[PDB]
Design a protein around this ligand. Structure first.
Ligand SMILES: *[C@@H]1O[C@H](CO[C@@H]2O[C@@H](C)[C@@H](O)[C@@H](O)[C@@H]2O)[C@@H](O[C@@H]2O[C@H](CO)[C@@H](O)[C@H](O)[C@H]2NC(C)=O)[C@H](O)[C@H]1NC(C)=O
Ligand SMILES: *[C@@H]1O[C@H](CO[C@@H]2O[C@@H](C)[C@@H](O)[C@@H](O)[C@@H]2O)[C@@H](O[C@@H]2O[C@H](CO)[C@@H](O)[C@H](O)[C@H]2NC(C)=O)[C@H](O)[C@H]1NC(C)=O
Ligand code: NAG
Ligand code: NAG
Ligand code: NAG
Ligand code: CHT
Ligand code: CL
Ligand code: CL
Length: 523
């Protein structure tokens, strides 16, 4: 049907889902296309239109480099943009239950992709299942990534930094001002994302400007305190300048640098983003969030430590094998096409790839902590993966949770350990980074595809995620399920998610994280 929004009318399309119907509005604009003089600037308000805007298909995805490491492989290509790339990419999608709901809780998705890639139109971010099954309204948006989204010149409005985060914020505002018209409750909005998406959600919890645009938060495999999540003002400057040189835009006047960069084609900017860093890693985030003094008013770690953040409930979690996915993008001896049994020497070279500017002592300390074998040919293969996963995702997430809960709010932590039966990647990579997503969005609820055990697991996660959003408590109260306990700094209880048996456990990776959280920061 047609919904009247603050800026004009929009037309959706009906979709058949599980013997029912969901109304989708794909591609609603929420900001002025950031083209020309508007490139690198915070998103500007949109101008009211007349006629009926047709939101019947996904809009353009934002400019970004694509993963070409495995042409023709679904494992990597399922994450690549499935929509035309373009600077004109500030659009959002809405899925609403049918018949129209009266005051439905709203779930807003923020995709990940290291702040360099990603898009809301991916097959695995389809919100129709959630709308259909739990009667919630699902919203997702495209936000600028890479240099076009995070290039920074602190203090300069021509390129202030964090533009992609402000894109996200403008979309949350759109929901605040328009979701009622779709039958949604702007007072019951839960943000949820994965990877850089999760890091973005955690930053919205810290940004005063986002405080009133949402109720609760869900962080899947990511938080701002991850080593790859925030670019230092130092790195940012060197990077903006390196990009300038590489494009022949170096100028005495910094604003002239930007004007120059505003004449380059999106491709020239994308082509040179990779080289702005002397030596990067398969986890490098060339252009990401920075302390801009606007969206972020101080180093986020300080804000977290001193309780300066939105007080509300949070649901946080990570996957069993967060690090494996990155091993095949640079680690010697690794390949998705063999068991990747590596040697001590390869493990050591591996650390060089993942910890480039780290002292020799720092790398030895990582090896000492992870090589105290408990024989087996895959010891080193498994150790490098845990090293990358604990350092980059698991430990930062736990620390974030512990620090956040220390200020009074209920927090729930999960450990996702189920390996999709349809995973394209080899078994040795295990429960990979990004592969709990399809379960959260309820893809396994669709029988035409996944085992029965997977349908049941996805059905529970969906119910838990929905109950969290609506009631702030991730329980599944009807089918004699394990109760999900609150996570406290003392006992640190967490729930495991799998098909076998869900369990309550305590102090995840206790020994490993003491190393990363307490010691490693010093080297
Ligand atoms: C800050 O940037 C300099 C310059 O980086 C180089 O030039 C850029 C345009 C880009 O092309 C990069 O790939 C280049 O590396 C960094 O200095 C470089 O350091 C490396 C050390 O391996 C050296 O080989 C290069 O010759 C240096 N570049 C030059 C010409 O000075 C510098 O390391 C960066 N600062 C940091 C964060 O360390
Ligand atoms: C697992 O494969 C890696 C990657 O090698 C490539 O992919 C293979 C499947 C095969 O098609 C090779 O021809 C390709 O080169 C192997 O790593 C290579 O090992 C050789 C010798 O040890 C070394 O010279 C190369 O530099 C390595 N390449 C990389 C990227 O590290 C590895 O040996 C295989 N391990 C097995 C079979 O268990
Ligand atoms: C929007 O969709 C309607 C109905 O399909 C169509 O009549 C109209 O021309 C469309 N507007 C466009 C393509 O600008
Ligand atoms: C939706 O619920 C909120 C409380 O969460 C209430 O304040 C608001 O008036 C309701 N919206 C409707 C149905 O008008
Ligand atoms: C609860 O159990 C019923 C039947 O036993 C099943 O159909 C349903 O999917 C389950 N609900 C949840 C939320 O798991
Ligand atoms: C980070 N994503 C899951 C979005 C892409 C694959 O790593
Ligand atoms: Cl492709
Ligand atoms: Cl159970």
């Amino acid at each position: 049907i047609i919904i009247a929004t603050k800026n004009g009318k929009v037309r959706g399309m009906q979709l058949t889902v599980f013997g029912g119907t969901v109304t989708a509005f794909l591609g609603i604009p929420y900001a002025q296309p950031p083209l020309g003089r508007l490139r690198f600037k915070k998103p500007q308000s949109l101008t009211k239109w007349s006629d009926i805007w047709n939101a019947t298909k996904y809009a353009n995805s934002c400019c970004q480099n694509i993963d070409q490491s495995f042409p023709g492989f679904h494992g990597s290509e399922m994450w690549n943009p499935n929509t035309d790339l373009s600077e004109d990419c500030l659009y959002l999608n809405v899925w609403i239950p049918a018949p129209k709901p009266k005051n439905a809780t709203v779930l807003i998705w923020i995709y990940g992709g290291g702040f360099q890639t990603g898009t809301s139109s991916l097959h695995v971010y389809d919100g129709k299942f959630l709308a259909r099954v739990e009667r919630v309204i699902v919203v997702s948006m495209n936000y600028r990534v890479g240099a076009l989204g995070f290039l920074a010149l602190p203090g300069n409005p021509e390129a202030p930094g964090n533009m992609g985060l402000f894109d996200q914020q403008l979309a949350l505002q759109w929901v605040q001002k328009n979701i009622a018209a779709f039958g949604g409750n702007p007072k019951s909005v839960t943000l949820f994302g994965e990877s850089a998406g999760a890091a973005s959600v955690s930053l919205h919890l810290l940004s005063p400007g986002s405080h009133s645009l949402f109720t609760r938060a869900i962080l899947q495999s990511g938080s701002f305190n991850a080593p790859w999540a925030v670019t230092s003002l130092y790195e940012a400057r060197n990077r903006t300048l390196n990009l300038a040189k590489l494009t022949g835009c170096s100028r005495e006047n910094e604003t002239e640098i930007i004007k120059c960069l505003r004449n380059k084609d999106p491709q020239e900017i994308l082509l040179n983003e990779a080289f702005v860093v002397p030596y990067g890693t398969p986890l490098s985030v060339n252009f990401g969030p920075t302390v801009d003094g606007d969206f972020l008013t101080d180093m986020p770690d300080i804000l977290l430590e001193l309780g300066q953040f939105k007080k509300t409930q949070i649901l946080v979690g990570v996957n069993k094998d967060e690090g494996t996915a990155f091993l095949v993008y640079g680690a010697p001896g690794f390949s998705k096409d063999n068991n990747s049994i590596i040697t001590r020497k390869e493990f050591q070279e591996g650390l060089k790839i993942f910890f480039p500017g780290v002292s020799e002592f720092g790398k030895e300390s990582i090896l000492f902590h992870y090589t105290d074998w408990v024989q087996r040919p895959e010891n080193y293969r498994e150790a490098l993966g845990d090293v990358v996963g604990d350092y980059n995702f698991i430990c930062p997430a736990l620390e974030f949770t512990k620090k956040f809960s220390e200020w009074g709010n209920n927090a729930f932590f999960y450990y996702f350990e189920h390996r999709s039966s349809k995973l394209p990647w080899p078994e040795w990579m295990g429960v990979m980074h990004g592969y709990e997503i399809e379960f959260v969005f309820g893809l396994p609820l669709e029988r035409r595809d996944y085992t029965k055990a997977e349908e049941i697991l996805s059905r529970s996660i969906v119910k838990r995620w929905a109950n969290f959003a609506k009631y702030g408590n991730p329980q599944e109260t009807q089918n004699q399920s394990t109760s999900w306990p609150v996570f406290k700094s003392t006992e640190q209880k967490y729930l495991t998610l799998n098909t076998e048996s869900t369990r309550i456990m305590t102090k995840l990776r206790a020994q490993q994280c003491r190393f990363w959280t307490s010691f490693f920061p010093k080297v």
